[PDB]
Symmetry: C3
Subunit: 185 residues, 3 copies
């Protein structure tokens, strides 16, 4: 029925810090091709608190494209957890947030329900791979990773996560999954 559910629960938001490189996106006009230019990169601030409200900043940037004439690009997002977070814990049962475009002290609400679908920790308890998506299989979906490239082994595991989460098999193939160019970055 296309309803996607979260796979990775009881996530530690303190670990939600550092740089992640976009590996692939789906073809939602909300994020594609705008957020899928070459060398696309996401820096996460890690948890900040505004009382019982938890949130995280994301700095997006990507490189120019000579053959397409596109200049380089950068913008900032804020992810606000929809459920209050206790001031005694940095762990949420599921990561469900609203997303804002931010500039200076201005913010504009983009979407009320962005989820961390899947999250994998390496052997040092740092995030290796993150998948972000909506509540339906045709809403924006992004695969990002700690390194610019992943082995084929790894990529097929990440695609299998989307299947287990409820994405239909015919959506898990091009032109509905598109890989981001990370060469020469």
């Amino acid at each position: 029925d296309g309803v996607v559910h979260v796979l990775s629960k009881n996530i530690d938001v303190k670990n939600l810090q550092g740089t992640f490189y976009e590996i692939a996106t789906n073809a939602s006009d909300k994020i594609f091709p705008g957020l899928a230019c070459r060398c696309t990169k996401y820096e996460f601030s890690g948890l900040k608190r505004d009382g019982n409200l938890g949130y995280v900043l994301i700095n997006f940037s990507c490189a120019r494209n000579f053959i397409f004439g596109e200049k380089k690009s950068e913008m900032t997002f804020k992810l606000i957890l929809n459920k209050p977070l206790d001031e005694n814990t940095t762990t949420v049962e599921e990561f469900n947030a609203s997303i804002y475009l931010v500039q200076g002290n201005q913010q504009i609400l983009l979407n009320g329900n962005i989820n961390i679908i899947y999250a994998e920790l390496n052997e040092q308890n740092e995030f290796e791979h993150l998948i972000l998506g909506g509540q339906k299989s045709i809403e924006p979906m992004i695969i990002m990773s700690k390194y610019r490239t992943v082995l084929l082994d790894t990529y097929n595991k990440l695609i299998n996560s989307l299947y287990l989460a409820g994405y239909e098999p015919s959506l898990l193939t091009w032109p509905f999954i598109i890989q981001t160019d990370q060469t020469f970055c």
Copy 2:
């Protein structure tokens, strides 16, 4: 000149039983895209006799496609050997048959000349790979296998069989050979 000839002769029709998964087809409108949906599968009845007439039933099925809105699909074929078969042998010099669409006790002739071009046996004398085709290089052609996927090693061997059979090199590349989606089946 595009005339294709059979490579694999003296075939045992008793071994023509079990399930085979479609790996690739050519682009003949007779079979593509109708018989090339995801998870396409062929069950062979193995030899049946109607006097000196030999034949085999094939149950086709494939899975639905959400993004294309296609429902799942299934139909039945009958392959009738064109040459009489002696009641004392299950082996033909070449497998040359007419193909019918079948439903209940009704049948409709589709094509008078379908051949087994290539057939490979594993070390237990079971069929591992089958290629079915016509008498010309632009007539329907199907590659099927005992498993859902084959190694690259193996796939290049099967493509080389089509070259040895008379298929022109420029037909052995996309968009003239198309691979079937066998993931998540």
Copy 3:
């Protein structure tokens, strides 16, 4: 700024002899698709002298294409070094030449500046890989090799040479780099 410069200097023109197979070209209408048909092949005469003028003949050929109806094709080029060459040396600091179409004792000037961008020698001091290109990143560019295919390892090294020479990253991906069909030749 798209200006490409030569990487490989102090090249020995005596070694510029033998057969090379085209691996990929860019999409310049000057050479694509004309010089990129299947089984495309280049025979180099090795250095000839006309006084202090050095030059080399190149015989191009490629195979027919049944599905496209194209007949086989062959033609001859002459590469004339633009700088005089001393009669005591077979080595140039850079290989910069004009290119002519040749037939019988007739010649027609095609382009005044064709360069050897990159050249790699194997362990026997023979050319293994050659990249030929212009003075801008959107002028014709051809990758050729001593064998019909190269390992992925090797191909990524050759693409990295074009980046170091000044080709923009967004030009080093399809549809701006196109691979030549070398199967069944």
